[PDB]
Amino acid sequence: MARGPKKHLKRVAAPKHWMLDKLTSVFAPRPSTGPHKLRECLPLIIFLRNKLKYALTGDEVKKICMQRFIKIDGKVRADITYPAGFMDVISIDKTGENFRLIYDTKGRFAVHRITPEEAKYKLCKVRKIFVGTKGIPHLVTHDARTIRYPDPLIKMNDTIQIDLETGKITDFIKFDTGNLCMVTGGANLGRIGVITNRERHPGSFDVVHVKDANGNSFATRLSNIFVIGKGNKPWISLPRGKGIRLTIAEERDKRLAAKQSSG
């Protein structure tokens, strides 16, 4: 079957980090088309009945979205399979709560509640600079927003703080060694550490070393690096564990050390 694009998605080929079961039926939600990559998305309904358990059936989530209590990036969305991804803020204004989508140290989108103050902006990577007609420059970001007239000194692999309401960036970082970074793709995920070094090749990818403040060195491809703030100075509130990432032996030891699994 290949006379056009498919529309079903199974459960057993579903991207594994949404933590689905398999004794519910064959299908899984499928992200609809949008700004983030299909693998990198967390569909809306999985945050609302397969995490926080406001709803219990998919029809219930549709009944929440219809009354429009949900926002994403300060605008109103009303699908059940809206494709939100990394660095967005969800905002329920009927609870007074704001969430942030960020990577756990085990590489899955966690619940990271935040102040309303922080929830007025997000961190956006620059990917492309493109001169349009009549000599105007542009930015292009991973959340796929086109912000016209950027000041010229911003280059790709940099990051920019965006004001959700108005565009028109507040600050930026210029990519270099000794800046604090998060990993967003690759087999490493959610790890935090300073850049330390870069390496360039002519075509065919290139890699970027990273080192943290716990004395571990690891590397990742260039295009999986994301900047979060100046050296040892995050401009976001980080979820617990701080991207350090333990081994399984040490992690076991903590649970049996406090002797705690309930409270």
């Binding site: 081994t247 399984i248 032996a249 076991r252």
Partner: protein
């Protein structure tokens, strides 16, 4: 979806020596079938197979430490192994009888009221015992070490408090309606 076959069959079909061991082992613990024996012996040989891996690979490699620690923890948790042992070499000193001792029917007999091992199996199945608060029908439980002092009769049953059975309660009414006047 997922299944597996727990027991295995003997390689040789007949051998007087082998058969005598399987017979006398069943006699001791009051087991039903030889399939209930080979099941146990599978478990032992399985644990012995995992163990034989870990002994070859240098100490202070992460695979050997984390696995061994959690393996031995589980052997200690059921109490077929001492913590005065707790080395991977002592896994191999394990043998068939220590498993069979931890079975529920053996522990019913050992630490509760029975008259023979044959009695004790029947009490578990006729629901006259519990394990802490919970009725069981399984005389093949394996009983965690901590819980070998919470084996009690059932809180409702003719043994301990609870209603009289229908052999008793029949005969009580046999003094008034079975021979009382009719």
């Amino acid at each position: 979806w997922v299944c597996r076959k727990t027991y295995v069959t003997p390689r040789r079909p007949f051998e007087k020596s082998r058969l005598d061991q399987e017979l006398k082992l069943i006699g001791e613990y009051g087991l039903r079938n030889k399939r209930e024996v080979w099941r146990v012996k599978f478990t032992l040989a399985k644990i012995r197979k995992a163990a034989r891996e870990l002994l070859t690979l240098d100490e202070k490699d992460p695979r050997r430490l984390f696995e061994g620690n959690a393996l031995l923890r589980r052997l200690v948790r059921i109490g077929v192994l001492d913590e005065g042992k707790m080395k991977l070499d002592y896994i191999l000193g394990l043998k068939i009888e220590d498993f069979l001792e931890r079975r529920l029917q053996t522990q019913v007999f050992k630490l509760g009221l029975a008259k023979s091992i044959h009695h004790a199996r029947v009490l578990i199945r006729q629901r006259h015992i519990r394990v802490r608060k919970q009725v069981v029908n399984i005389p093949s439980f394996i009983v965690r070490l901590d819980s070998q002092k919470h084996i009690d009769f059932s809180l409702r049953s003719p043994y301990g408090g609870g209603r009289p059975g229908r052999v008793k309660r029949k005969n009580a009414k046999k003094g008034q309606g079975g021979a009382g006047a009719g």
